[PDB]
Design an enzyme around this catalytic site. Structure first.
Site, PDB file in Angstrom:
ATOM      1  CB  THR B  10      54.688  42.768  28.952  1.00 54.09           C
ATOM      2  OG1 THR B  10      53.422  43.174  30.006  1.00 54.09           O
ATOM      3  CG2 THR B  10      54.395  43.371  27.564  1.00 54.09           C
ATOM      4  CB  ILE B  12      57.014  35.499  34.274  1.00 52.08           C
ATOM      5  CG1 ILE B  12      58.419  34.700  34.071  1.00 52.08           C
ATOM      6  CG2 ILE B  12      56.025  34.620  34.881  1.00 52.08           C
ATOM      7  CD1 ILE B  12      58.798  34.664  35.427  1.00 52.08           C
ATOM      8  CG  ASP B  56      42.605  48.001  33.680  1.00 57.72           C
ATOM      9  OD1 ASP B  56      42.653  46.963  34.033  1.00 57.72           O
ATOM     10  OD2 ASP B  56      42.699  49.161  34.425  1.00 57.72           O
ATOM     11  CB  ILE B  57      41.421  42.804  31.271  1.00 59.06           C
ATOM     12  CG1 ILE B  57      42.034  41.904  32.157  1.00 59.06           C
ATOM     13  CG2 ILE B  57      41.888  42.601  29.983  1.00 59.06           C
ATOM     14  CD1 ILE B  57      42.532  40.354  32.277  1.00 59.06           C
ATOM     15  CE  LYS B 122      49.388  31.838  45.500  1.00 58.50           C
ATOM     16  NZ  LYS B 122      49.966  32.015  44.384  1.00 58.50           N
ATOM     17  CE1 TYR B 154      45.701  31.351  40.645  1.00 59.49           C
ATOM     18  CE2 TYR B 154      46.470  29.426  42.026  1.00 59.49           C
ATOM     19  CZ  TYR B 154      46.835  30.730  41.319  1.00 59.49           C
ATOM     20  OH  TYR B 154      48.110  30.972  41.216  1.00 59.49           O
TER      21      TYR B 154
HETATM   22  N1  LIG Z   1      55.037  34.087  38.324  1.00 58.14           N
HETATM   23  C1  LIG Z   1      54.931  32.822  38.939  1.00 58.14           C
HETATM   24  O1  LIG Z   1      56.016  32.665  39.657  1.00 58.14           O
HETATM   25  C2  LIG Z   1      53.699  32.051  39.334  1.00 58.14           C
HETATM   26  C3  LIG Z   1      53.911  30.816  39.795  1.00 58.14           C
HETATM   27  C4  LIG Z   1      52.568  29.827  39.725  1.00 58.14           C
HETATM   28  C5  LIG Z   1      51.467  30.527  39.463  1.00 58.14           C
HETATM   29  N2  LIG Z   1      51.210  31.617  38.657  1.00 58.14           N
HETATM   30  C6  LIG Z   1      49.836  32.179  38.447  1.00 58.14           C
HETATM   31  O2  LIG Z   1      50.177  32.366  36.903  1.00 58.14           O
HETATM   32  C7  LIG Z   1      48.885  33.409  36.804  1.00 58.14           C
HETATM   33  C8  LIG Z   1      49.473  34.244  35.756  1.00 58.14           C
HETATM   34  O3  LIG Z   1      50.592  35.171  36.339  1.00 58.14           O
HETATM   35  P1  LIG Z   1      51.965  35.498  35.946  1.00 58.14           P
HETATM   36  O4  LIG Z   1      52.837  35.347  36.949  1.00 58.14           O
HETATM   37  O5  LIG Z   1      52.122  34.801  34.651  1.00 58.14           O
HETATM   38  O6  LIG Z   1      51.837  36.997  35.686  1.00 58.14           O
HETATM   39  P2  LIG Z   1      52.725  38.325  35.224  1.00 58.14           P
HETATM   40  O7  LIG Z   1      54.039  37.793  35.152  1.00 58.14           O
HETATM   41  O8  LIG Z   1      52.792  39.180  36.669  1.00 58.14           O
HETATM   42  O9  LIG Z   1      52.342  38.979  34.013  1.00 58.14           O
HETATM   43  C9  LIG Z   1      50.969  39.776  34.109  1.00 58.14           C
HETATM   44  C10 LIG Z   1      50.755  40.321  32.921  1.00 58.14           C
HETATM   45  O10 LIG Z   1      49.572  40.942  32.733  1.00 58.14           O
HETATM   46  C11 LIG Z   1      49.425  42.192  32.347  1.00 58.14           C
HETATM   47  N3  LIG Z   1      48.373  42.844  33.098  1.00 58.14           N
HETATM   48  C12 LIG Z   1      48.241  42.849  34.731  1.00 58.14           C
HETATM   49  N4  LIG Z   1      47.055  43.364  35.021  1.00 58.14           N
HETATM   50  C13 LIG Z   1      46.134  43.530  33.843  1.00 58.14           C
HETATM   51  C14 LIG Z   1      45.163  44.265  33.519  1.00 58.14           C
HETATM   52  N5  LIG Z   1      44.283  44.502  34.545  1.00 58.14           N
HETATM   53  N6  LIG Z   1      44.847  44.268  32.260  1.00 58.14           N
HETATM   54  C15 LIG Z   1      45.463  43.893  31.413  1.00 58.14           C
HETATM   55  N7  LIG Z   1      46.802  43.381  31.427  1.00 58.14           N
HETATM   56  C16 LIG Z   1      47.104  42.956  32.707  1.00 58.14           C
HETATM   57  C17 LIG Z   1      50.925  42.708  32.934  1.00 58.14           C
HETATM   58  O11 LIG Z   1      51.285  43.754  32.309  1.00 58.14           O
HETATM   59  P3  LIG Z   1      50.747  45.349  32.694  1.00 58.14           P
HETATM   60  O12 LIG Z   1      51.002  45.411  34.122  1.00 58.14           O
HETATM   61  O13 LIG Z   1      51.520  46.250  31.796  1.00 58.14           O
HETATM   62  O14 LIG Z   1      49.261  45.328  32.612  1.00 58.14           O
HETATM   63  C18 LIG Z   1      51.872  41.434  32.245  1.00 58.14           C
HETATM   64  O15 LIG Z   1      51.824  41.459  30.866  1.00 58.14           O
HETATM   65  C19 LIG Z   1      48.503  33.813  37.989  1.00 58.14           C
HETATM   66  O16 LIG Z   1      47.279  33.128  38.409  1.00 58.14           O
HETATM   67  C20 LIG Z   1      49.596  33.606  39.096  1.00 58.14           C
HETATM   68  O17 LIG Z   1      49.397  33.357  40.259  1.00 58.14           O
HETATM   69  C21 LIG Z   1      52.665  32.481  38.578  1.00 58.14           C
HETATM   70  C1  LIG Z   2      52.829  33.194  51.858  1.00 57.08           C
HETATM   71  C2  LIG Z   2      53.972  32.432  52.091  1.00 57.08           C
HETATM   72  C3  LIG Z   2      54.762  32.515  53.208  1.00 57.08           C
HETATM   73  C4  LIG Z   2      54.730  31.604  51.139  1.00 57.08           C
HETATM   74  C5  LIG Z   2      54.210  31.587  49.616  1.00 57.08           C
HETATM   75  C6  LIG Z   2      54.890  30.517  48.742  1.00 57.08           C
HETATM   76  C7  LIG Z   2      54.555  30.841  47.398  1.00 57.08           C
HETATM   77  C8  LIG Z   2      55.652  31.399  46.539  1.00 57.08           C
HETATM   78  C9  LIG Z   2      53.272  30.659  46.804  1.00 57.08           C
HETATM   79  C10 LIG Z   2      52.644  30.854  45.578  1.00 57.08           C
HETATM   80  O1  LIG Z   2      53.159  31.537  44.739  1.00 57.08           O
HETATM   81 CL   LIG Z   3      50.248  29.635  42.417  1.00 53.77          CL
END
Ligand SMILES: NC(=O)c1ccc[n+]([C@@H]2O[C@H](COP(=O)([O-])OP(=O)(O)OC[C@H]3O[C@@H](n4cnc5c(N)ncnc54)[C@H](OP(=O)(O)O)[C@@H]3O)[C@@H](O)[C@H]2O)c1
Ligand SMILES: CC(C)=CCC/C(C)=C/C=O
Ligand SMILES: [Cl-]
Ligand SMILES: NC(=O)c1ccc[n+]([C@@H]2O[C@H](COP(=O)([O-])OP(=O)(O)OC[C@H]3O[C@@H](n4cnc5c(N)ncnc54)[C@H](OP(=O)(O)O)[C@@H]3O)[C@@H](O)[C@H]2O)c1
Ligand SMILES: CC(C)=CCC/C(C)=C/C=O
Ligand SMILES: [Cl-]
Ligand code: NA
Ligand code: NA
Ligand code: NA
Ligand code: NA
Lengths: 364, 364
Positions: B10, B12, B56-57, B122, B154
């Protein structure tokens, strides 16, 4: 059959079109190629199977004489220009050159299908003497927003091109807008890589540091560039793809870089100590390289190089003009949305073009 | 047969993988899909034909219970994380989550072929609490230069992944490093578009200007982003293309933009007056939006929206974290050189994701 006319065949893009058009895997091949320039054909342009034509396209009589017998042309690739002290004079000179070619080719070539015109990023940035002095659109530049309210020989040429194609049903056009070109051509009026190679060779000879002759924004802001073979591929794609017809397109490599990084690459390729941007130095190659002709003759003799004139192989004013400004980026979305997915890794491209200047013995 | 396990269905990117994997034109299809998350399946995730699993992983017992019967999995797509007050704790929590999944799936799935791990920029910029405080490599970031000398969850996850794949012959891995994601997910912990839509809807309701809550570099320096469907396509490509095996890859859209321009787009989509960056205002959404829950309930009621909690649909801290820093660019050369030519026009992508939040009645 596909028959190309390259207008500016010994140029930085003309030389890439001369090498790529005759290849077996080129779309719409096999291509027959005519190539036009004023000077006798140079040795480094001989490795291509083109029909070389000496013609000064600023002369209507010479253009009529040389181009009227080439009745089989199907595609024109226009890759040349004339520099003048003001943009008003550039509009006059460049408009006449393009008009002289098109007025002859269109009525004499019944199978003429396309005219590809190369312009550049100054469509958005403004003429040389207005860069940095005017309000432009905010980068990244996209193709179809209003023109700047200043004369520009690219506007003159586009308007002439649109009126010219009206003379023949089904005749299409394309416009190609590169940024600074990385390529090979010891005769080019705007050859950044060739000029930087000569500067590096002079530093190596003199045991001097490769100091950076440019501004802070050029050193550690982002830059991009346009690989000459990718531009040649972009001309061919727009000339043959019906979904690209009658459109202007940017053509840059699909990545960005910093001169702070590429300076290390340039220095490594010539075995010279790498310098760095120095606040307040305001270094200009046009000034540093004044009176260096005897040094160049010595480097040519000691390294068994092809005999070149320093003023032809090193266009100092142009390297200063590039490096003394920030490099606004452009967008490749319109080209990609039209199906052109060509790209180049700019660092690998820089090394390739430095190494081609070495391979043809222009620099050590 | 191809059988996917989406860890974070669920999310992004999880929601984009859930929509794209089952499509007819998806490579290696038809795909059977299992999707894991903790909460009950939300309505906006139902339009996809996936096998939803509550798990819950972070709980080894729950992971053993829920995942051990899924013996047919061939590809794992790991798209989740846990936030903590320090990176040291993020390493501990996130390493345990990935270890709990892989320790169960690897020995129980004899046809397991690939594990795709999503990380992010990051990797190069540093953890949240070190961004802007440390020396990083100079942008554009490329994939295979040394890691920063600071803990990063990471790095913990990559090292665990490399040790895990050693358990099964022929098991390959990929790492995917997006920048800020533009996508759809009212449950995401990092959803810039969803959060900005809620801010714009509150400004519209209150008859207030859409003021820019960020820094000058975010306003008129260059930025980029990563479209969630393009990231999902990038996960699938690396999971099925043998020439992409065992590699980390950046995944961004192939263009750049400025928030100064996208702010006008956001304002137009909500019918609000567009504000602009103001020197010295240092605007934070976490502060501006404090106590706005009754205003959100009113907007939900008046516009017939889906009932959402303001703290779930608008992650103010994350929008502030993005917009209060310059956006260093990354490179797509390694992905393109490996044959991944997918891209998105970022402005069109922004409108698409704003409009999806409107289509599912999350915002007016
Ligand atoms: N979103 C961004 O802008 C962005 C940008 C760059 C990098 N990233 C990286 O992408 C990676 C994935 O994050 P995302 O942003 O795609 O995640 P997200 O949109 O926050 O989605 C997380 C998903 O995992 C589930 N979840 C959370 N904790 C869980 C657990 N303990 N067990 C099972 N399911 C769990 C959530 O649902 P529930 O809460 O219902 O469990 C949801 O389905 C991370 O390393 C993040 O730092 C994200
Ligand atoms: C911590 C601060 C001041 C900015 C974070 C920028 C960003 C959104 C990185 C990765 O998600
Ligand atoms: Cl990131
Ligand atoms: N090079 C760059 O970095 C760059 C960057 C962006 C845009 N552009 C634009 O690209 C366009 C084409 O320029 P280019 O840089 O590719 O040119 P170039 O490398 O300078 O080559 C010009 C060619 O045309 C020939 N030529 C010059 N005047 C001629 C005339 N009167 N009649 C016949 N041939 C003539 C030259 O040979 P002879 O001297 O022997 O005749 C040479 O073959 C221009 O609009 C330029 O502004 C170039
Ligand atoms: C005129 C100045 C100061 C810079 C020109 C930058 C450039 C190389 C544009 C087009 O060729
Ligand atoms: Cl130009
Ligand atoms: Na670089
Ligand atoms: Na090349
Ligand atoms: Na923009
Ligand atoms: Na999209």
């Amino acid at each position: 059959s596909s028959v190309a006319l390259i207008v500016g065949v010994t140029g930085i893009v003309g030389n890439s079109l001369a090498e790529i058009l005759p290849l077996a895997d080129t779309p719409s091949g096999p291509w027959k190629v005519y190539g036009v320039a004023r000077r006798p054909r140079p040795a480094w342009n001989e490795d291509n199977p083109i029909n070389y034509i000496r013609c000064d396209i600023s002369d209507p009589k010479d253009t009529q004489e040389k181009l009227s017998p080439l009745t089989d042309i199907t595609h024109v690739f226009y890759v040349t220009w004339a520099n003048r002290s003001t943009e008003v004079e550039r509009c006059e000179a460049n408009g006449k050159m393009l008009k002289n070619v098109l007025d002859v080719v269109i009525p004499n070539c019944p199978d003429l299908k396309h005219i590809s015109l190369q312009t550049g990023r100054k469509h958005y940035m403004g003429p040389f003497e207005l860069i940095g002095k005017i309000e432009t659109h905010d980068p990244p530049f996209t193709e179809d927003l209003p023109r700047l309210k200043f004369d520009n020989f690219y506007y003159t040429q586009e308007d002439l091109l649109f009126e010219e194609v009206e003379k023949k049903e089904g005749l299409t056009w394309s416009v190609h807008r590169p940024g600074n070109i990385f390529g090979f051509s010891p005769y080019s009026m705007m050859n950044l890589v060739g000029t930087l190679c000569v500067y590096a060779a002079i530093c190596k000879h003199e045991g001097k540091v490769l100091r950076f002759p440019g501004c802070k924004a050029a050193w550690d802001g982002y830059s991009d560039c346009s690989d000459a073979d990718l531009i040649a591929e972009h001309h061919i794609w727009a000339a043959v793809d019906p979904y690209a017809k009658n459109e202007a397109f940017n053509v840059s490599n699909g990545d960005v870089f910093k001169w702070k990084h590429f300076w290390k690459v340039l220095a490594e390729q010539f075995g010279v100590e790498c310098g760095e941007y120095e606040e307040g130095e305001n270094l200009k190659l046009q000034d540093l390289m004044k009176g260096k002709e005897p040094v160049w003759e010595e480097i040519v003799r000691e390294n068994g190089l092809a005999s070149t004139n320093l003023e032809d192989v090193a266009v100092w004013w142009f390297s200063d003009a590039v490096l003394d400004i920030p490099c606004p980026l452009d967008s490749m979305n319109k080209s990609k949305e039209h199906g052109f997915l060509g790209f180049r890794n700019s660092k690998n491209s820089f090394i390739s073009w430095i190494d081609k200047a070495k391979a043809y013995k222009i620099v050590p």
